[PDB]
């Protein structure tokens, strides 16, 4: 598509959290909507700044909703004056999930940026996933004969920071971020998080299939098509060829680990030699 990846900077996250807090203070809000500002680099978006815009929606009817687009233009001229390289690249809303009227709001957002990217920034601190979920409006041409509709296609999101933005973040995370853990421990924690993330994704599919079985939602026939590919891609680890290759590759890495451990032990012995020489020399003169 037109966007390969969306990079959301920590300033946007803090601005979105603050935006939800200040308006949420005066009145209980389902969500707050703002405008995302950033630059374009190849096909990866670089969302770096955002400002709040007035917004309200009636819960009963998705059709009734107001976005102060005159405020949107007025505030853009502010940010363009300070930073001309930050242009409107989409919008954001803090609702935990997508809303039915989001495709309607995007059309209002689309006239300022034709390839508008909606990034859902969850204020609630989710334990596993990233708070940002980037979407883009595309034309889903169905093969069932149903007329083409406007749907949000998910775009991979990543939280990256500018050099100066990273400097402030580490200042704010100085006490709680524990950098003493080694690289090897960090990767294993990533693997544990990968297992947790995969498990959560699989429960979401299982929950969807459970509701489909009991009739809560009908058969999509695109998820089921996708699901057959998922289970078909499940490799058979019991094949003799794969097992022999796995054993052959595992033993190849083990000897390198063995060589590295062998070098480590004697280097450790060299350090112990120097320590005892230093200790013996120090006590001899004293």
């Amino acid at each position: 598509l037109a966007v390969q990846k969306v990079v959301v900077h920590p300033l946007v996250l803090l601005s979105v959290v603050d935006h939800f807090n200040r308006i949420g203070k005066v009145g209980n809000q389902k969500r707050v909507v703002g405008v995302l500002l950033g630059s374009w680099q190849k096909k990866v978006l670089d969302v770096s700044n955002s400002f709040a815009v007035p917004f309200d929606e009636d819960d009963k009817d998705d059709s009734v909703w107001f976005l102060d687009h005159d405020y949107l233009e007025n505030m853009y001229g502010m940010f363009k004056k300070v930073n001309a390289r930050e242009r409107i690249v989409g919008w954001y809303h803090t609702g935990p999930k997508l809303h039915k009227n989001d495709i309607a709001i995007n059309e209002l957002m689309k006239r300022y940026c034709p390839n508008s990217v909606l990034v859902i920034i969850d204020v609630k601190p989710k334990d596993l996933g990233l708070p940002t979920e980037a979407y883009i409006s595309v034309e889903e041409v169905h093969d069932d004969g149903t007329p083409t509709s406007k749907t949000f296609e998910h775009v991979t999101s990543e939280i990256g920071a500018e050099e100066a933005e990273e400097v402030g973040v580490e200042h704010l995370l100085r006490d709680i971020k524990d950098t003493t853990v080694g690289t090897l421990s960090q990767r294993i924690t990533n693997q544990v998080h990968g297992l947790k993330g995969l498990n959560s994704k699989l429960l979401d599919i299982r929950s969807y299939l459970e509701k489909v079985a009991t009739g809560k939602l009908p058969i999509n026939h695109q998820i089921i098509y996708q699901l057959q590919d998922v289970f078909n891609l499940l490799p058979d680890v019991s094949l003799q060829e794969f097992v022999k290759a796995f054993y052959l590759k595992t033993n190849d890495q083990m000897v390198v680990v063995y060589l590295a451990s062998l070098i480590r032990s004697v280097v450790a012995l060299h350090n112990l030699i120097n320590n005892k020489i230093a200790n013996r020399d120090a006590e001899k003169k004293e």
Binding site: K244, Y247, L248, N251, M254, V255, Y258, S261, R264, S265
Partner: protein, 194 residues
């Protein structure tokens, strides 16, 4: 280690005797070194492994380990006649050394190694030829001897009673198994321990 050796716990005996040599004095206690070396050689032969050739080269151990050096040579060839010749020659020395009982148990090990090379060298070997190579009494006795070796995992082979030969199994690619990982694991974990 001597206790474990008598109780047929050779694997744990070898670890302690090897450890005993390490913690022995580096320049003195020669007599202790000779006693442990003599017992470690038998335990190593009893376990089916091989004694280190270097220990027979030392000036102090050369005279003492010579009867055991000839014993190791006899066990290595897997020949009963060569093993027995050492017994009728160094029997009194082993008795005066307190190791005669463990040498007697080496007769089963001499059979074990000799069968192992027969399977390792011959794809299909007649039972009569096995008896000749192991200097057994008759091919029918070698029939049970090889049969127990197959069930014990000593050699992977099969016996054709009607034809009268033993067919050794095709050697499997050992690197495509978990054995290299297991050998490395006991070596990797020891390096990390140091």
């Amino acid at each position: 280690g001597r206790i474990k050796a008598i109780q047929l716990e050779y694997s744990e005996a070898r670890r302690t005797m090897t450890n005993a040599l390490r913690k022995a004095p580096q320049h003195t206690a020669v007599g202790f070194k000779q006693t442990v070396h003599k017992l470690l050689i038998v335990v190593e032969l009893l376990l089916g492994e091989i004694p280190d050739r270097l220990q027979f080269r030392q000036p102090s151990l050369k005279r003492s380990l010579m009867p055991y050096f000839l014993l190791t040579q006899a066990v290595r060839t897997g020949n009963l006649a060569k093993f027995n010749q050492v017994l009728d020659q160094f029997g009194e020395k082993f008795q005066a050394d307190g190791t005669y009982t463990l040498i007697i148990r080496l007769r089963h090990n001499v059979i074990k190694t000799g069968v192992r090379m027969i399977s390792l060298s011959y794809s299909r070997i007649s039972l009569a030829d096995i008896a000749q190579k192991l200097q057994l009494d008759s091919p029918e006795d070698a029939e049970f001897i090889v049969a127990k070796a197959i069930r014990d995992g000593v050699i992977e082979a099969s016996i054709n009673h009607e034809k009268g030969y033993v067919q050794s199994k095709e050697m499997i690619d050992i690197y495509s198994t978990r054995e290299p990982q297991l050998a490395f694991h006991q070596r990797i974990s020891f390096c990390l321990d140091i």
